[PDB]
């Protein structure tokens, strides 16, 4: 019962990343559904990583042999969670890859959108993760890499994100991306819609994907 103390670190998003996030949140786009494709691709890439590292060193699957993606809608807390057993991210990975370091493509993507590009283009510009903000007012990333502890990344945009040691449910190895869906984006909690968009845009993923439906 004694009071637990948890360390938090707050970080500023690189300037253009912040500008991109604002643009994603504040402009209307049709075709927002592609966000799911982006997150499954990231999971896919992370699963490739672990599969390859494990040929080199089999003891990298100690933290779990199965390589897969799970989708978990929750109509009670209005969240959609994408879980993989890929490589995971170290603390430095989260800080460096998800927000503090400039991406080569950001500027090109913002011009391309200002010119009328379909939001679907985001993948090609190396900034696909931020498509989460088409549908989510807040995103939490839980992650565990073999070389590090479990950490939580979180941002409601607005220019900052935080990183902290995670003291929730141990994950083993991989990444859990939790989308707190905006009020008007709850269609992404529907099993038909999720099935629909996986079939359309994510049908050549090289790992099994399971959808967990409550009831």
Task: Please name which of 211, 189, 196 lies closest in space to residue 68, comparing C-alpha atoms.
Answer: 211
Does residue 46 belong to the site contacting ligand ANP (CB under 6 A)? Answer: yes
Residue number of the CB closest to Mg ion reads 128
In this complex, which beta carbon is closest to ligand ANP, that of residue 1 or of residue 104?
Answer: 104
In this complex, which beta carbon is closest to ligand ANP, that of residue 46 or of residue 179?
Answer: 46
Q: Which of 34, 95, 98, 132 binds ligand ANP (CB under 6 A)?
A: 98
Q: Which of 80, 89, 139, 209 binds ligand ANP (CB under 6 A)?
A: 89
Task: Please provide residue 190's backbone torsions phi and psi, each rounded to the nearest 5 degrees.
Answer: -80, 130
Note whether 64 and 87 are within 8 A (CB): no
Does residue 43 belong to the site contacting ligand ANP (CB under 6 A)? Answer: yes
Is 212 known as a binding-site position? no
Task: Please name which of 22, 40, 41 lies closest in space to residue 133, comparing C-alpha atoms.
Answer: 22
How many Cα atoms occupy the beta-carbon half-sphere of 41 within 13 Å?
16
In this complex, which beta carbon is closest to ligand ANP, that of residue 20 or of residue 194?
Answer: 20
Task: Please name which of 163, 158, 30, 38 lies closest in space to residue 89, comparing C-alpha atoms.
Answer: 163
As measured in angstroms, the least distance from the Cβ of 111 to ligand ANP is 18
Sites of contact with Mg ion (CB under 5 A): 42, 128
Does residue 113 belong to the site contacting ligand ANP (CB under 6 A)? Answer: no
User: Residues 6 or more apart from 178 whose CB is under 8 A from it?
Assistant: 79, 80, 81, 139, 140, 141, 142
How many Cα atoms occupy the beta-carbon half-sphere of 16 within 13 Å?
13
* Binding segment toward ligand ANP, per CB under 6 A, in 28-36, 37-45, 164-172, 183-191: 37-45
Window 120-139: residues binding ligand ANP (CB under 6 A): 126-129
Q: How far apart are CA 204 and CA 180, in angstroms?
A: 27
- The binding site consists of 42, 84, 103, 129
Which chain residues interact with ligand ANP by CB under 6 A? 38, 42-43, 45-46, 84, 86-87, 89, 97-98, 126-129, 175
């Amino acid at each position: 019962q004694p009071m637990e103390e948890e360390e938090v670190e707050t970080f500023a998003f690189q300037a253009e990343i912040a500008q991109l996030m604002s643009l994603i949140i504040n402009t209307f786009y049709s075709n927002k559904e592609i966000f799911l494709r982006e997150l499954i691709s990231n999971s896919s890439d992370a699963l490739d990583k672990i599969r390859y590292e494990s040929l080199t060193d089999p003891s990298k699957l100690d933290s779990g042999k199965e390589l897969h993606i799970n989708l978990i809608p929750n109509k009670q807390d209005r969240t959609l969670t994408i879980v993989d057993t890929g490589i995971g991210m170290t603390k430095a990975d989260l800080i460096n890859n998800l927000g503090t370091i400039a991406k080569s493509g950001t500027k090109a993507f913002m011009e391309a959108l200002q010119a009328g590009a379909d939001i679907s283009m985001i993948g090609q510009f190396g900034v696909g993760f931020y498509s989460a903000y088409l549908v989510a007012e807040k995103v939490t990333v839980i992650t565990k890499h073999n070389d590090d502890e479990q950490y939580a990344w979180e941002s409601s945009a607005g220019g900052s994100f935080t990183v902290r040691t995670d003291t929730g449910e141990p994950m083993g190895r991989g990444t859990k991306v939790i989308l707190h869906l905006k009020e008007d984006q709850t269609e992404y909690l529907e099993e038909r819609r999720i099935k629909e968009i996986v079939k359309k845009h994510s049908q050549f993923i090289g790992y099994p994907i399971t959808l967990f439906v409550e009831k």
